[PDB]
C-alpha cells in the first residue's frame, strides 16, 4: 500500500484525465462470442451461444495477430462489433475438467509398490525431471500410460503419486464423458485437452474409469458407439502431433485393452503398461505405520503381529482394518486400541466386511 501509492498511483494520476474517461466509451452493454474468420479489413464473424451468426466489423483494440479464431472475445450488445479480446476459458472445452494442485498421495504412502515406482518414473517423471537420458539416446519418451487393477488402489494411488514428485497439477478427465454420442463432439473435446495443458505445460493429463470409449463393439448398440470409431481414430493424430520434452503426460485407465483400436494404441507411443501386483509383506507395514502413529498401541501389539496372518490386502483395505480396530475401542470407551480388538477386527474385515472365504478345491 505504501510502495504502490508512491509508484503505481502517480503513474495513473497523469493519465487520469484520459485513461479514466476513454475506458468508459465502450459502455456497460457488452456481449461475448466466438471468432470464426479474421481479415485485415476490420471485419469478422462472431457467434454467441444463441447462434446469432452475424457479419460485423472490428474496433481497434489489439492487432489481428492476437485475435485467434475459436476464442471468446468481448463484443457489443446491439451492433455485435468486436471491441476487444478476452480469455478462451469461456469456451466449453471439456465437459468435466478439474485441476487438482499438490496431490496428497506420494510414492511413500502407496506401500510396497516400489517395484512399480521406478518403472512408472521412467515413462513419466524421468523425462520431466531428467529428459537428457532420452535426449542422449535420441529417442522420444512414451507419452501414454495404460493402467489396470481396481479403483482406489492401482487406478488411483498410482495416478496421484506420480503427480506429486513432478510438481504438476493433477488434471482429471472422465473417460465416459469423452463420447457425447454426437458427430463432431468427439474430436472437439479431445483437441481441447492438449490446448489447456499445451501453453506453459503447467499440468499433466490424467484419465480414469473408461468403460465406454474403450469398447466400440461393432455397432452403436450393445455397449459400443459409432462416434467412438471416429474419436479414437482422430485422437491418434493428437498423440503424434503433440510434442514436448515430457512436461505433459497422458495416463489412461481401462480394464481391457483388447477392445481398443490398434491404431490409437500405436506401440512406441505408449511403452508403459502397469499390471496389478499382489501386495508383499512390506506393503502392509507401510500402511500401518501411518495410522499407528496417531493411534496408541498396547504392549501386545507389534509390527510382526498384524502381518502374521494376512491375505495380502491392498494398501486401502489395510486402512479399513485400522478403522475397525478403532471402532471396537469406542465400544469399550477408550482411545487406545488393545490387542484384543485386532483379533476380532482381522476376522470381520477379511470375512464379514469383505466376502471372499477363499473358495478352494482348485478354484
Amino acid at each position: 500500500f505504501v510502495s504502490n501509492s508512491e509508484i503505481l498511483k502517480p503513474f495513473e494520476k497523469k493519465q487520469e484525465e484520459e485513461k479514466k474517461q476513454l475506458e468508459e466509451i465502450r459502455g456497460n452493454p457488452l456481449s461475448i462470442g466466438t471468432l470464426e474468420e479474421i481479415i485485415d479489413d476490420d471485419h469478422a464473424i462472431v457467434t454467441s451461444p444463441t447462434m446469432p451468426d452475424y457479419y460485423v466489423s472490428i474496433l481497434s483494440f489489439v492487432d489481428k495477430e492476437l485475435l485467434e479464431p475459436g476464442c471468446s472475445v468481448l463484443l457489443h450488445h446491439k451492433t455485435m462489433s468486436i471491441v476487444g479480446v478476452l480469455q478462451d476459458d469461456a469456451d466449453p472445452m471439456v465437459s468435466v475438467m478439474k485441476m487438482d494442485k499438490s496431490p496428497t498421495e506420494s510414492y511413500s504412502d502407496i506401500g510396497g509398490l516400489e517395484s512399480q515406482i521406478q518403472e512408472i518414473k521412467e515413462s513419466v517423471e524421468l523425462p520431466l525431471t531428467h529428459p537428457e537420458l532420452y535426449e542422449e539416446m535420441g529417442i522420444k519418451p512414451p507419452k501414454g500410460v495404460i493402467l489396470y487393477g481396481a479403483p482406489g488402489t492401482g487406478k488411483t494411488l498410482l495416478a496421484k503419486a506420480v503427480a506429486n514428485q513432478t510438481s504438476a497439477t493433477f488434471l482429471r478427465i472422465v473417460g465416459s464423458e469423452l463420447i457425447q454420442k454426437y458427430l463432431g463432439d468427439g474430436p472437439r473435446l479431445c483437441r481441447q485437452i492438449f490446448k489447456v495443458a499445451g501453453e506453459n505445460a503447467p499440468s499433466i493429463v490424467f484419465i480414469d474409469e473408461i468403460d465406454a470409449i474403450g469398447t466400440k463393439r461393432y455397432d452403436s448398440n450393445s455397449g459400443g458407439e459409432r462416434e467412438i470409431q471416429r474419436t479414437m481414430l482422430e485422437l491418434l493424430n493428437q498423440l503424434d502431433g503433440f510434442d514436448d520434452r515430457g512436461d505433459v503426460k497422458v495416463i489412461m485407465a481401462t480394464n481391457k485393452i483388447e477392445t481398443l483400436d490398434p491404431a490409437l494404441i500405436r506401440p512406441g507411443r505408449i511403452d508403459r503398461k502397469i499390471l496389478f501386483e499382489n501386495p508383499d509383506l512390506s506393503t502392509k507395514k507401510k500402511i500401518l505405520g501411518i495410522h499407528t502413529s496417531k493411534m496408541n498401541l498396547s504392549e501386545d501389539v507389534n509390527l510382526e503381529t498384524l502381518v502374521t496372518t494376512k491375505d495380502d490386502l491392498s494398501g486401502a483395505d489395510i486402512q479399513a482394518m485400522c478403522t475397525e480396530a478403532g471402532l471396537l475401542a469406542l465400544r469399550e470407551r477408550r482411545m487406545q486400541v488393545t490387542a484384543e480388538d485386532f483379533k476380532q477386527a482381522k476376522e470381520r474385515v477379511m470375512k464379514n466386511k469383505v466376502e471372499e472365504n477363499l473358495e478352494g478345491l482348485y478354484l
Binding site: 493519465q15 484520459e18 485513461k19 476513454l22 475506458e23 466509451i25 465502450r26 470464426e36 474468420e37 481479415i39 479489413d41 476490420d42 471485419h43 464473424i45 451468426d53 452475424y54 457479419y55 460485423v56 466489423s57 472490428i58 474496433l59 481497434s60 483494440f61 479464431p69 451492433t79 455485435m80 462489433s81 471491441v83 521412467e122 515413462s123 524421468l126 537420458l133 532420452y134 542422449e136 539416446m137 535420441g138 529417442i139 522420444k140 512414451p142 458427430l183 463432431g184 474430436p187 470409431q229 471416429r230 481414430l233 482422430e234 491418434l236 493424430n237 483400436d261 490398434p262 491404431a263 490409437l264 494404441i265 500405436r266 506401440p267 512406441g268 507411443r269 511403452d271 503398461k273
Partner: protein
C-alpha cells in the same frame, strides 16, 4: 498508441459500425458465413430474398440470372446448406480449413517404417507408378488404369508412409486430406474440399489425391444419406461427375484409406470407380531388419550388435510395433545405467512386446 486506439470508438468506429453492421442488419438482416433478408420487394431480376437459416426457406423463380460479383445489394448474400436456383455463382466458400489441407510435392520419404513393403509397391506399380511415369503405354494396351485405388490393412498402419514412397519414383504431388476433419459445423465442407482437389489436379499433371480416413465420410452417412443436410451426399457427386466423366484417368488419380470395405457406399465399391484393393501385409525377416538399422542411426547403440537377430525373434509386426522395439531398447539401458543400448537391451524389448501384448 494505447490512448490513441481508445477514442477511435467515438470517431472512426462510428462510420465503421454504421457501414459494417447497420447496413448488414437493415430490415431485420468480405467473408460471409450468414445472410438474411426480411420482406424485400424488388422487381425475377436480382430478387434474391434467401434465408440461410433452416427456418422459413425461400426460392427464386422467374427465369435465370447470373451475377457472380454483386447479386442484389451485396452485403449479406449466402447459400450454405440448400442451393436455390440462381444463387449458385456466389457460394460461401470461406473457411479456416488450411490447417486440414496438407500438400507435399515430391515427398522425400523412401523407407523408414515401410522397409520391406516392396510387395505392396508392386501392387501399386502397375496401376499407379506406371501411368504417372509413362501414361502413353496404355494406348497400345487398349485399356487404361482404373479411377480409384482402395487401401486395406491394420488400422493406422501402412496408410501414411507407404503412399508417399510410390510418389517418390513418379515425382508426383501427394495431397493428404483427413476425412474426420472434413466433418465440421459447416454443411458441405466435405463436398467443397473435394472440389478444390480436382481444380489443382488439372493445372499440374501427374498428381496424387489421397483421402485419409474415408470412413468418416464415405458415400453416405446418417446426417446426409439418412439426414436432410447435404455434405457427404454432395461429396459423392464430385467423385463421379468430375473424376469419371470430365477428368482423364492418366493424369488425375484418386486413392482412399479405410479399415473395412463395408463401411463405404456399395455404389462406390462397384466397378468403374473403385477397383484396385490393396491389402497391407506385415514386413518379413528382411523387411523388419532394414527398419531397425535405420532407427539405429538416430539412436546411440553398440557398434558390435546385429540387427538381423533382433528382427528374427520378433514375429510379424506393424509399423508401430517395430518402432516400439527401438524406443523400448533405451528404457532397459536406464536400469543398467548405460549410454548406449547393447544387444541384451533389444532382446528384452522384443520379449516385452511378445509377453506384454500376445496378439
Amino acid at each position: 498508441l494505447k490512448q490513441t486506439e481508445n477514442d477511435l470508438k467515438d470517431i472512426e468506429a462510428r462510420i465503421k459500425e454504421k457501414a459494417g453492421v447497420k447496413e448488414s442488419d437493415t430490415g431485420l438482416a468480405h467473408p460471409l458465413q450468414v445472410a438474411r433478408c426480411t420482406k424485400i420487394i424488388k422487381g425475377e431480376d436480382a430478387k434474391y430474398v434467401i434465408n440461410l437459416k433452416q427456418i422459413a426457406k425461400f426460392v427464386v423463380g422467374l427465369g435465370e440470372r447470373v451475377s457472380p460479383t454483386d447479386i442484389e445489394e451485396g452485403m449479406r448474400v449466402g447459400v450454405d446448406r440448400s442451393k436455390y436456383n440462381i444463387e449458385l455463382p456466389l457460394p460461401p466458400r470461406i473457411d479456416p480449413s488450411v490447417t486440414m489441407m496438407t500438400v507435399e510435392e515430391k515427398p522425400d520419404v523412401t523407407y523408414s517404417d515401410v522397409g520391406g513393403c516392396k510387395d505392396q509397391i508392386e501392387k501399386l506399380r502397375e496401376v499407379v507408378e506406371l501411368p504417372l511415369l509413362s501414361p502413353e503405354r496404355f494406348a497400345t494396351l487398349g485399356i487404361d488404369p482404373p479411377k480409384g485405388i482402395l487401401l486395406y490393412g491394420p488400422p493406422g498402419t501402412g496408410k501414411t508412409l507407404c503412399a508417399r514412397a510410390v510418389a517418390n519414383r513418379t515425382d508426383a504431388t501427394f495431397i493428404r486430406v483427413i476425412g474426420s476433419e472434413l466433418v465440421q459445423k459447416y454443411v458441405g465442407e466435405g463436398a467443397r474440399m473435394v472440389r478444390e482437389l480436382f481444380e489443382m489436379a488439372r493445372t499440374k499433371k501427374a498428381c496424387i489425391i489421397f483421402f485419409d480416413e474415408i470412413d468418416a465420410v464415405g458415400g453416405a452417412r446418417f446426417d446426409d444419406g439418412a439426414g436432410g443436410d447435404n455434405e457427404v451426399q454432395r461429396t459423392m457427386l464430385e467423385l463421379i461427375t468430375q473424376l469419371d466423366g470430365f477428368d482423364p484417368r492418366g493424369n488425375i488419380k484418386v486413392m482412399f484409406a479405410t479399415n473395412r470395405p463395408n463401411t463405404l457406399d456399395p455404389a462406390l465399391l462397384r466397378p468403374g470407380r473403385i477397383d484396385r484393393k490393396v491389402e497391407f501385409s506385415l514386413p518379413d525377416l528382411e523387411g523388419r531388419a532394414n527398419i531397425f538399422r535405420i532407427h539405429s542411426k538416430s539412436m546411440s547403440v553398440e557398434r558390435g550388435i546385429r540387427w538381423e537377430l533382433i528382427s528374427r525373434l520378433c514375429p510379424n509386426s506393424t509399423g508401430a510395433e517395430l518402432r516400439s522395439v527401438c524406443t523400448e531398447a533405451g528404457m532397459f539401458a536406464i536400469r543398467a545405467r548405460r549410454k548406449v543400448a547393447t544387444e541384451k537391451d533389444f532382446l528384452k524389448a522384443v520379449d516385452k512386446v511378445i509377453s506384454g501384448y500376445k496378439k
